[PDB]
Amino acid sequence: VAPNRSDNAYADYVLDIGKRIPLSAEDLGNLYENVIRAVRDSRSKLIDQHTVDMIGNTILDALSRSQTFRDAVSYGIHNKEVHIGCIKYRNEYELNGESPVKVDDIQSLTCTELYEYDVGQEPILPICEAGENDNEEPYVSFSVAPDTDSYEMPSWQEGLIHEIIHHVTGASDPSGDSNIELGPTEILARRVAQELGWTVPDFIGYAEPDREAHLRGRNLNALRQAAMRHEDNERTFFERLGMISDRYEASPDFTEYSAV
Ligand SMILES: [Zn+2]
C-alpha cells in the first residue's frame, strides 16, 4: 500500500500525506522559533558563526518559501517521523584514505595542506549524514558553510536540505549503486532547490560519477573557504574542527577566534 522508503515514489507519497494538515501561520511561527533554538543549541558542534547563520537562514528560507519543504516538514510532525525543531547540526569530518598528508590528526592540519592536493587526495572529508546520538536525538552532520556569494552556496544549501529530509520524512537514498535514479530524498531536495531558486547541476543518478565528483569538489572548496575565513586563527580553527570530529562540545561562543 505504501512504497519502500528507497523508491522514488516515496517522495510523492509523503508530500500528499503532508498536505492533509498544512502548516498554518501559527504552526510556521512556532517552527521558526523552534529552528532558531535548535540552531542556537547547535553552536557547540559547528565550526564558526558564519556556518551557524547559513544553516539557520537556509532552513528558515526553506520553510518560508518552499511548499515542498513545508509539506515534508508537516508530514514528519503529523506522521511519527522527526519534528524539524528536534534536529541539531554538526560539522564532523574524517581523514581521507588515499591522502598522502604528513599528519594523522585533524587538529594539526594547515591551510596549505588543503590547497596542496586536489580532489581525490585531500586530507579530510565532511561526514554528510542524518543520524542520531545514544539518546536517539536526531542530528545532521554536514560540510562547513562556504562563503556568502560563493559558487558553492546553492549546492551546499540543497545538500543541507537533503539531510534534513532524511529525518523529517523518513525517506532513504537508493538501495544500491544507483546511476539512473536520484532516490526520494534527493528528488525532494531538488524540488525544494527549484522552488527556492538554488541552481544546482542537473544530475539523474544519486551515485553517478559526475555527482560524486561535484560533491567532492564542493566540499573541498567550502572547507578551503572556511579555513581562509579564519586564516589568522589557523591553529584554533583546525583544533575546533578536530574537536567536533571527535564528538566533543566546543565553545558555543567561538572562544578560539576571540582576541583573548
Ligand atoms: Zn542522503
Output the CA 211–ligand 1 centroid distance in Å. 13
Neighbours of ion ligand 1 (CB under 5 A): 173, 185
Binding residues for Zn(2+) are: 162, 166, 173
Output the CA 19–ligand 1 centroid distance in Å. 23
Q: What are 57's three cell numbers?
A: 537562514
Distances (CA, A) of 78 to 174, 177, 256: 25, 32, 41
CA separation for the pair 28, 115 (Å, rounded): 42
| Number of domains making up the chain | 1
Q: Which residues contact 95 (CB under 8 A, 6 or more apart)?
A: 104, 106, 123, 124, 125
Output the CA 189–ligand 1 centroid distance in Å. 10
Expressed as residue numbers, the domain containing 181 is 1-260
How was it solved?
X-ray
Question: Rounded to the nearest 5°, which phi and psi values hold at 126?
Answer: -75, 145
Resolution of this deposited model, Å: 2.2
Output the CA 150–ligand 1 centroid distance in Å. 23
